[PDB]
Design a protein around this ligand. Sequence first.
Ligand SMILES: CCCCCCCCCCCCCCCCCC(=O)OC[C@H](COP(=O)(O)OCCN)OC(=O)CCCCCCCCCCCCCCCCC
Ligand SMILES: CCCCCCCCCCCC(=O)OC[C@H](COP(=O)(O)OCC[N+](C)(C)C)OC(=O)CCCCCCCCCCC
Ligand code: SF4
Ligand code: SF4
Lengths: 190, 112, 233, 61, 60, 78, 128, 123, 71, 340
Amino acid sequence: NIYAGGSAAAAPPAGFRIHRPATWEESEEGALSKATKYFLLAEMFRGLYVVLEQFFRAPYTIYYPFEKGPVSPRFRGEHALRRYPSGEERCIACKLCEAICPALAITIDAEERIDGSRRTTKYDIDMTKCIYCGYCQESCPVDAIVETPNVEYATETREELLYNKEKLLANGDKWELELQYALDADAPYR
Amino acid sequence: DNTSTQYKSIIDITAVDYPSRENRFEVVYNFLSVRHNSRIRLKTYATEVTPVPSITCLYEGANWFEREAYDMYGVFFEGHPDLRRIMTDYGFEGHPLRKDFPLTGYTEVRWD
Amino acid sequence: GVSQDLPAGLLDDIYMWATQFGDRLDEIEELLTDNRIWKLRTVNIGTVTAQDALNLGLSGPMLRGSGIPFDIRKNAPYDAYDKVDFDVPVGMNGDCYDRYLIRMAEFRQSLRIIEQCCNDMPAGAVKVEDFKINSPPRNLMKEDMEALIHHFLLYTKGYSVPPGETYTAIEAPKGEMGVYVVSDGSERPYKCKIRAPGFAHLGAFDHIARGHFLPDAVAIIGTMDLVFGEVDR
Amino acid sequence: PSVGQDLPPVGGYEPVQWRRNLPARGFRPLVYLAALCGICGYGFYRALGGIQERRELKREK
Amino acid sequence: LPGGPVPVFKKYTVGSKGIWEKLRVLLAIAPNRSTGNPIVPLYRVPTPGSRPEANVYQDP
Amino acid sequence: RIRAFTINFGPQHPAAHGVLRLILELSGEEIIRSDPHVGLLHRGTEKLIEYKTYMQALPYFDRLDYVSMMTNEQVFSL
Amino acid sequence: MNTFIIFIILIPIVGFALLAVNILLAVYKPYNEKLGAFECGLTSFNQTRLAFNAAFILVAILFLPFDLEISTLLPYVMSIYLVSNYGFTIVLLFLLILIIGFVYEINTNALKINKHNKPNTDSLIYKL
Amino acid sequence: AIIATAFAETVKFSGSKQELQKRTLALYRQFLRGAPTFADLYEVQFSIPTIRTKIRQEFERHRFVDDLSIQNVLYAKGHMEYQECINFWKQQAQFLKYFPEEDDIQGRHQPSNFVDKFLKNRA
Amino acid sequence: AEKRIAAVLESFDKISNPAAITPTASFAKDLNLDSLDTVEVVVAIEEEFGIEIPDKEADEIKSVNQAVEYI
Amino acid sequence: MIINIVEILIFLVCVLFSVAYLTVAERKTLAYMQRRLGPNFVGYYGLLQAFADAVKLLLKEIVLPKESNYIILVISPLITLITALIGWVVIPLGPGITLGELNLGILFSLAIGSLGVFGSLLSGWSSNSKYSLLGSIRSTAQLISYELILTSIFIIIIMFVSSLNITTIIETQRVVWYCIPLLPLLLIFFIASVAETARPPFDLTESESELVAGYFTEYSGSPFVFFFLAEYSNIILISAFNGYLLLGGYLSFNYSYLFNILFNDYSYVSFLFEGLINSSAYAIKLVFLMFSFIWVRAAFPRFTYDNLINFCWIILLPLLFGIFLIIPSTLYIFDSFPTL
Ligand SMILES: CCCCCCCCCCCCCCCCCC(=O)OC[C@H](COP(=O)(O)OCCN)OC(=O)CCCCCCCCCCCCCCCCC
Ligand SMILES: CCCCCCCCCCCC(=O)OC[C@H](COP(=O)(O)OCC[N+](C)(C)C)OC(=O)CCCCCCCCCCC
Ligand code: SF4
Ligand code: SF4
């Protein structure tokens, strides 16, 4: 009806008060069966058996680096700068990657090339600032900056992780075929 | 404690810095009523020298929230039993969530 | 919405994982649920009363273990939780063992919801269809002038959010996760405060752990389900 | 429109198992108690017979 | 009761054949339980980089 | 007069998960007072978000409860 | 010089040889920070000895009488046939007497550490 | 409940400057008394008198502040710092922030006049 | 005994007359010791004798004579 | 002399290498119970893993903390290892086939065993940390508590035999292994042996304590090797106690008929074959008990200190006193007191 300080949904549901706990004298199991369970550790033995069953199942381990875990076309690994089939660079220095970069990991410099083209004179990625989010690759209007599926590029010195333009272009040249597999698989979804 | 409100859970306390106002800081309280399935927000104001009454007497959960509000903004809470920094480094100078505190602060560390 | 659509063979693979996850849960329960040592470590350990749970700011299992049936997915439904069928487990003793049982039941309810989503996944777009908010697809971006302009602007300036404020909360796996965001009408939030359930749980630690033994403290930390990036943001 | 999207089967998937599946196994507890009694009693029979025969060997020595 | 136990041959996990299947059924705590190893010809095949649907996908 | 014994449970401790400094006070066996010191992982995320666009701020939410990334994203998105 | 004595001499020799090899081959570069006690990476203040519970004392003290009780049965098990029925009665009486002490220990709850802090169970009463 | 820690004082803004002066001199006494505990906790090279001198210099810095609210805040923060130091919550690294002079000479060239500052582009 | 107190309070700065320490000399009136200086000398006394002195009694001390009367 | 030296070298090599390979076996067995592989890379099939760990540790710097009694901290693990290995001198792999054939062999086992608490007791004193002292105190209390249980079971067994010679105790089980009439004592002895070696689920000191990793937290280099070796050596030795007290030691089955078919007279071939059969029986029992230690580690969570002290003093010890009463009563009822 009319509620004061309440409502139908704040009324307790049917059966919300719990039943009274049962005492020892209202137990179905006799004391000898309970003592058998108590002294012979029945549920502990069930647990041991469950563990032992696993011992005869196939393990999950793979033998890295001779085998490899699953990788997908969208995976975000080490960066590369790509070319056109002619060999001309795709990057035209729009600086959209630099603007979007959540970690401010990209530093770009550009001017007019002696042939009149709009091109970068400096393209740096601080890989120790990068968060590997893929936003640069989404932002690029010409598919110039990409993330490869490569994760195996650990270094012994930090200076080796400051990628300049030569390093990134060489990465593009090195990984172009894998990049093409990934693009052929995921371009329709972008 | 009113029967039609019954906001028993304290959700959060924070501050917002408005440097144009004479009172810089607005203190925001959010409350939940599980009884009525309802939320409510309450605002007040403060400056760098005028405190606010602590609500720890009413909600124990408020304790840490007021500490964070003191650590980030410098708002004091009168009646808070144990009010000290909770986030920043020991001996940290400044309240980093003020609009005039620079993003990277004033000091950095290294091994000497 | 989401940044990309699902790839072609994903629903089938999620379904095949779902057909065996139930057994995976049963074997963990075989090791734990009835183990008398597990009960010695969890029963009547880290007890919280319902009134104190509310007063301390606890949420999620930390609250449902004390007997209070509250869950944002049922109380204030968001994205598609109103369209799926699931149950909410509620404790009565407010201890670590009740909270363990709650989490184990929540495993099963999540499996239920995942199966319903695998069966009812509809067709259409996955992000809002306004290019002033989300970027247009790339074949439009490289063919259509408006699409290119909107893409350029979204990735350099960002969209503008109407001025105002909100506190928005969801039933995150560790309890109620909220954000209080203040917009000044620009492309950058004026203020953003994160309400982490672990913050309030760790705040309640001193009230809950008093009078316990040190291993009980280890168990209580484990029952609060703490991740510290949440705690100190 | 929608071409090439991941979608569910027309009839749907067969239901998965999500409810607790921990069936009770084993004889009733008193069966294990009876087996323990029988094992121990037979062992005591053998051990006491062995002790008695050892005592007769001691007599001979 | 929906959600109840389903037999092991309706779960996409490898399992056992022949005499070993009889042995496993005799020795399992719960015979309807799967082992957890995905069936290699069926699972994540074809690989996500060689889906035919990619060449027909259009923006929805 | 009861004299508490004070232990630093953590940060470099398996149960303390590397970053919690739980200062406990024990009278023999029992905890009498507990003082969790935090901020060993305070990164200033909330300060950083104010200098980001909303789109640029989204990935910070992945890194809050870093086993529950997508629900963190979901709350910010909602 | 049987195998027993030679083996007993040989074990400590091998331990000392392994120790000597470690001393000879490992580097040794002590310095102040390395020499600190490891307590989770921090430093704690030196403290007066912790106050301990009485059960800690009681387990160790009560070990000795129970250990002596158990070890006093060695002469019985080594003489059981010789003393057969008379000594069987005597050893039963001895065991029963010691069991009375076990009963005292059990009923006094002597080895239980009681959690000093307990939930408050008082009713809430209002004077209207 | 959530109980306060060692040497915690609830925040109270004194309504009068004399009632604050009492609390302030008490805090100064506490610092001077804790100086030897500080020298033991933080394994310092310098002497106990150096610590007490530093404490005096700290309290001296605010000797002429007039506004009551500002003095209240200075007192509450000074008490926070006392609680931080006496509980060993600080490590040595942050404690030694207070003693920049105790470190050795940083170099031969600390300019004082205009020409020396101008030769280092600091004029 | 009082000579130890005179020795403690003699070795302090800001006072140019070491012989001005008469058994009933007030720090704020004769020595011209500051409020902070008074706290310092009280702490030095209580440290020299190894005794702790409570807040009210410490603040009420204002002179050498009261120091001995409490010593 | 020469034969003595050869026999001691053979026995010592077998024991030390068995201890080395028990650690590898634990890692592999835990791994396969956890659906992984374990060491399969250091050596073929991971068979050199233990030796890699040993060489690594032997080349690792020893640290002596500042507040530390350095002598006590370097000798405590040494004495625990020395007593642990000395325990092996009385274990027989066939009738009289032992390094020490002592008429007081059981007493030797118990005495050397009771020297096993001093490592935990002295390790905490090694430093000047109150965390360390409390942890060492608890571990010592657990150790002596379950020492009582083990000693009681020893005495209960000797009630059937009336001998302290280990070979004789094994020899009387040719009629029945003592685990058959006293199966609950098999369960109790295994539980107490796990507790006495401070193995999971009885590993308070190392895994829930103030110091991160027990009272060995401060140990590096060869002292750490000593503690680790002593622990695994005690696992195998306490399992050997279990084997000869309750599992019939080196007894498997009556091979008289088979030997009479195979051989027509005594030779070194028949002697070698009988020795192999006896030793293989004892070895396979030891293997099952080691596997059980690892299996129990795989299956269960830990006790607390209060739980385990209660388990020893309120549940197990009263049962053992009741058994003290009932065993001589059964021997009296049926007139079966054992002769000497
Ligand atoms: C029916 C008539 C019986 C007549 C008398 C019985 C004769 C003796 C029977 C032999 C076995 C007795 C020894 C085991 C008794 C265990 C009893 C027990 O449950 O202890 C419980 C104890 C907590 O005490 P409590 O208060 O009583 O429990 C109430 C909890 N709400 O907490 C505990 O201690 C938990 C139990 C300890 C388990 C230890 C586990 C360590 C390793 C497990 C060994 C399993 C076998 C390993 C071998 C591998 C398998 C091949
Ligand atoms: C409180 C205990 C009450 C138990 C009563 C059971 C009596 C049943 C009748 C069978 C006896 C029999 O007939 O077998 C006789 C046996 C073996 O002697 P034997 O060489 O074969 O006889 C020939 C007599 N000579 C030698 C003079 C020629 O003697 C026994 O000791 C076996 C008794 C069965 C074991 C009972 C132990 C109970 C468990 C105790 C756990 C504390
Ligand atoms: S992946 Fe993200 S963080 Fe890294 S460079 Fe690209 S946009 Fe910047
Ligand atoms: S990589 Fe792409 S987004 Fe970045 S500057 Fe070059 S063209 Fe523009």
